[PDB]
Design a protein around this ligand. Structure first.
Ligand SMILES: Cc1ncc(COP(=O)(O)O)c(CNc2co[nH]c2=O)c1O
Ligand SMILES: Cc1ncc(COP(=O)(O)O)c(CNc2co[nH]c2=O)c1O
Lengths: 326, 328
């Protein structure tokens, strides 16, 4: 973690107030603070990048701001205004700027904005007191384990929110994966236990065919998986590069069948931390199957090169995704 | 409000659960990266301590809570707190804060809140290697109306609904607001997959009474894997059998509830749980539909069971099943 953190308080009637930059250090809670009992909390994640001209920039921070608000609404948490969200990013970079790594490769500074209920009380109801903190931390094909025993979120629930509870529910599967020598978990839909949703901390894309004829398929926003900002961006970039894209349902049977037939030629996972991570093989119960030759796919690495290029300030930001933080 | 003291126990991978100690009730500290603040790795319980006429403090089925906290812990990848350490923590707090247990023998008792949360600093999504357990205490039949949630779902099969886990409660807060907006006091939740089978209330299990007198049948949702196996629920099923009522655990459709209530087949409805013991349900809102349960008054079977269970917990009715045990 870096040297400082940004703290902001909420009190009913007063709104979000008392924003201040303080050292990174322990915080205090009443034993009956609602977050310790009923998990009323939401969070975000995004990076600060250093550019060649010496500036520090963010990638689609406005999207994170709005998503923290969408998550907060689902959890009955008062929304942090986008302007205050953005300003907290600027405040932290101003004091901890030396922590942002050099330009220009994979290295960046990870920013963790988060909100938790602090009001003391064992009644099960939305809190009237909260805290927001902003902290910072300095920041290869994988195998995936299909979870059949566990479900992470369901329609009408909290899966489209970045809510701590979704991650808690995933811990046992994430241990069961490692016990099968897999790197990550792919989650299936709650209702029919068939349709691909997402991985534990990433969205998932499928490449079908190859060359100019190659096209992208990704699970549609079901209501129970996260609308990732990397996912959103890659949809836009694929369209920019002339790839057909389909947001639709795809189940594990279609995945296995089309991979075996060689129609699915690449699979990749995407998210803020790794940008894009190739998926080489899949374990589904007793069976295992490989994606193509198990190596990083052509479209996979082309999209990754485009997106990291924009983020590092090497390639034109045609969508106006980058903004200055310091 | 809270009593004077709390019990604190730490978990670390070399020591396991250790350093159990009675300390004043007061603020606790967490690293900003403590896993509970990001990924909600936490579970909890709730039970009461009762003062009896003879001066003793007793627990009701505290062994059941000890085991359920372990079951909850297991589902949330939390190292289990041994049952003996759980029971001892109840005894430790009652020993110093006994004077806080209210007088015998009405509705008043001392509510106990055992709870575990992840304290290890780290932003990696993995089970914590460090936890804290706290035990805190807090001093503790009007019919209610219920709103059937059709828009929100509280837990998923394959999920965490059979565990007493903070995240189930977090997920439920938005629906509880829609209920108030429609005049109702509590929320009834339906199953995730088919959006039609009755699960439970936000903090209580639900029962239906069919018919009347000795031939009445007590009906309750079967354990689905996504609703909480309430200890009050478990006890009332036994008490119903003791009394000679037929009991049925099964899947019950929401469209069956209103239909049988309107036909006079469902004669009573109630909710049960640690805090209120039994709360009669008078009225139900489901979408546009609204229906009443009989005359809206507490039902005969409802109050017979409530009187028996409260009687056992206050020591005035014979404890045939050995549910009551000395705390201090
Ligand atoms: C469940 C889940 N799905 C998808 C994603 C990808 O979302 P994106 O990053 O906005 O593209 C994340 C990562 N979300 C996080 C982003 O930064 N830290 C995170 O935990 C996630 O936790
Ligand atoms: C979702 C849910 N279902 C059912 C119940 C009833 O469970 P029982 O009390 O064991 O009969 C509770 C209350 N659980 C609590 C028991 O004490 N404090 C509580 O929050 C609950 O929170």
């Amino acid at each position: 973690h870096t040297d400082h953190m940004v703290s902001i308080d909420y009190a009913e009637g007063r709104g979000w107030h008392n924003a201040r930059v303080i050292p990174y250090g322990p915080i205090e809670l009443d034993p009956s603070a609602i977050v310790l009992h009923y998990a009323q909390e939401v969070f975000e994640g995004l990076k600060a990048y250093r550019w060649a001209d010496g500036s520090i920039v963010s990638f689609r921070a406005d999207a994170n701001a709005a998503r923290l608000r969408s998550s907060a609404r689902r959890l009955a948490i008062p929304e942090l205004p986008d302007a205050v969200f953005i300003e907290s990013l600027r405040q932290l970079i101003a004091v901890d700027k030396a922590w942002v790594p050099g330009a220009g490769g994979e290295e960046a500074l990870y920013l963790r904005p988060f909100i938790f209920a602090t009001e003391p009380g064992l009644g099960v109801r939305p809190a009237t007191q909260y805290r927001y903190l902003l902290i910072a931390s300095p920041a290869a094909p994988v195998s995936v384990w299909v979870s059949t025993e566990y479900v992470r979120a369901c329609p009408g629930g909290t899966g489209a929110a970045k809510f701590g509870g979704n991650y808690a529910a995933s811990l046992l599967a994430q241990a069961e994966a490692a016990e099968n020598g897999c790197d990550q978990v792919v989650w299936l839909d709650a209702v029919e236990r068939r349709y691909i949703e997402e991985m534990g901390g990433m969205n998932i894309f499928f490449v079908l065919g190859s060359g100019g004829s190659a096209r992208l398929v990704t699970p549609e926003l079901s209501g129970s998986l996260l609308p990732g900002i990397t996912r959103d961006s890659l949809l836009q970039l694929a369209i920019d590069a002339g790839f057909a894209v389909e947001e639709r349902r795809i189940d594990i049977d279609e995945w296995q069948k089309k991979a075996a037939a060689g129609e699915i030629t690449e699979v990749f996972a995407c998210g803020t931390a790794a940008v894009i991570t190739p998926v080489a093989r899949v374990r589904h119960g007793a069976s295992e199957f490989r994606i193509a030759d198990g190596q990083p796919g052509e479209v996979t690495m082309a999209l990754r090169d485009t997106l990291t290029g924009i983020q590092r300030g090497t390639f034109a930001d045609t969508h106006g995704w980058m903004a200055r933080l310091g």
